[PDB]
Amino acid sequence: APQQINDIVHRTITPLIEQQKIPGMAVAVIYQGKPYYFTWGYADIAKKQPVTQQTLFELGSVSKTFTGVLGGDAIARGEIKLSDPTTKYWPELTAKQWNGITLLHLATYTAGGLPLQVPDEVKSSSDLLRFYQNWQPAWAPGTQRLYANSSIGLFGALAVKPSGLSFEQAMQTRVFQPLKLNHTWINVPPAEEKNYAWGYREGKAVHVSPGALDAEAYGVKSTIEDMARWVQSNLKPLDINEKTLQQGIQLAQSRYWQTGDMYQGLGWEMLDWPVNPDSIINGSDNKIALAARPVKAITPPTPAVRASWVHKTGATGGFGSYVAFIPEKELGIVMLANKNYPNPARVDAAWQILNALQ
């Protein structure tokens, strides 16, 4: 890499790893469209396996960006509309509180208080139906945002129903394959296990547990190379040859709702660039990010704004991920770690790197 990118990344990430006791980390910077890669530490402490550019990390909720783009692609295919009622795709959802709750509300966490987590107790398809039928909204639809797996997870499951494909097959064929993300997985195959890092939580090696709507809300694993490619694809969707995918990526960066200075996309979240770094840094802390906040509808949604900081944090029990990019500057970053360390530290490091390069 150019020495500037080298120095800027190492000066930022080295102290981060030290302060946060991160066992292993991979970083990609996309600069003028090209990726530059950096790795540190251990994918597996016990077996002394280093982090490489081929190490798989759990993306946790950065998976929501793939779900949002897959949904956008389904809209572009004419398979679903965000204006469709949820019941159009799940007619068994007959309880009256669902009247007026559309796919847009599910995709954007604005259905009226669907919870962060699907209860552990919910396994089966019928457990799931039961859960949503019994769920009681605290708020009218389209009035409050509450970040929630049970919201965007259901959006992803419903979005692929007209295709007839499983969520995983739709994701593989319509997003991973066309983008050449050939080392990105909802279920890690046995052949790729050698590359699957352990996560570390309180010093114990852990991997994400199965759960309902896991694939759709937080279940993607990927490498630093495929994630750089994901960022490049979202930075420059016009280079993408598959028309509906290009369009889906654009739709996922449309601005649907505003709360404070952030705008809710499909999976992606966006702020105007130049950002106030305290705003994105403090904003990423779960004290704010997981809070219930009133929203203003953007009527109609603003199409993808090039001058945006577009980003998403993700975590599982053992992993902490972050992706951010600025379309107008052809600039982006991916930070993958196998410890779930605090969000504000991620965003601070990212902003320090990108601000120094823009």
Ligand SMILES: *[B]([O])([O])C1=[C][C]=[C]C([N])=[C]1
């Ligand atoms: B995501 O990483 O923000 C997330 C939120 C809640 C639960 C899970 N598994 C992921």
